[PDB]
Amino acid sequence: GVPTYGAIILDETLENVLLVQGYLAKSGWGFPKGKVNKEEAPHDCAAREVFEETGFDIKDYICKDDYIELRINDQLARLYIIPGIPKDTKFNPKTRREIRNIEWFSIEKLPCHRNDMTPKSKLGLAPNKFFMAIPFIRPLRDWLSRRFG
Ligand SMILES: CCn1cnc(C(=O)NCc2ccc(F)cc2)c1
């Protein structure tokens, strides 16, 4: 697949992250992000995807080195970490045909792994509406420790 870029936006306490919920195949919650255009810089793709999905402009806050990148089934997803955005900020998508909802979620209440089905003697993972966000939660928790303490 083609690389995706986006943001992990945090509030002022650093307790909460901003997630978006899509429709149909993208019906769960995740960080706002999307596919790079041809010849587009990562930081510009991130700013654009976040603006389209949330109405918030991260251009003046992105730090070029502050991101978490994961290759997930051979698809790179890089999310720039944007701390300190006020929780009263009013978010409104441009592409409202693709975004159902936009909400803050507590980091400490988000899972950092999905639960198994071992009490059912069944292999695999139970469905989780935070599936897309989950792989970033531990690395974010470790980046926040290392940056802020
Ligand atoms: C099981 C696969 N799946 C479920 N939900 C997603 C998902 O990415 N939701 C968040 C989102 C981000 C951006 C966007 F434009 C629309 C939705 C992926």
From Swiss-Prot:
Q: Where is this motif: Nudix box?
A: 34-55
Q: In which tissues is it expressed?
A: Expressed in brain and testis. Not detected in heart (at protein level).
The listed outcome for E53Q is:
Strongly reduced decapping activity
Organism classification, top ranks? Eukaryota, Metazoa, Chordata, Craniata, Vertebrata
- Gene name, please? DCP2
Query: Cellular location of this protein?
Result: Cytoplasm, P-body; Nucleus
**Binding of Mn(2+): at which residues?**
E49, E53
Domain Nudix hydrolase stretches: 1-131
Name the family the entry cites: Belongs to the Nudix hydrolase family. DCP2 subfamily.
Protein name in the entry: m7GpppN-mRNA hydrolase
Q: Where is the signal peptide?
A: none
Originating organism:
Homo sapiens
Q: How does it assemble?
A: Found in a mRNA decay complex with LSM1, LSM3, LSM4, EXOSC2, EXOSC4, EXOSC10, PARN, XRN1, CNOT6, UPF1, UPF2 and UPF3B. Forms a complex with DCP1A, EDC3, DDX6 and EDC4/HEDLS, within this complex directly interacts with EDC4/HEDLS. Interacts with DPC1B. Interacts (via N-terminus and C-terminus) with TRIM21 (via N-terminus and C-terminus). Associates with polysomes. Interacts with LIMD1, WTIP and AJUBA. Interacts with DDX17 in an RNA-dependent manner. Interacts with ZC3HAV1. Interacts with APOBEC3G in an RNA-dependent manner. Interacts with ZFP36L1 (via N-terminus). Interacts with NBDY.
- Say what the protein does: Decapping metalloenzyme that catalyzes the cleavage of the cap structure on mRNAs. Removes the 7-methyl guanine cap structure from mRNA molecules, yielding a 5'-phosphorylated mRNA fragment and 7m-GDP. Necessary for the degradation of mRNAs, both in normal mRNA turnover and in nonsense-mediated mRNA decay. Plays a role in replication-dependent histone mRNA degradation. Has higher activity towards mRNAs that lack a poly(A) tail. Has no activity towards a cap structure lacking an RNA moiety.
Q: Which domain of life is it from?
A: Eukaryota
Known post-translational modifications? Phosphorylated at ser-249 in a MTOR-dependent manner.
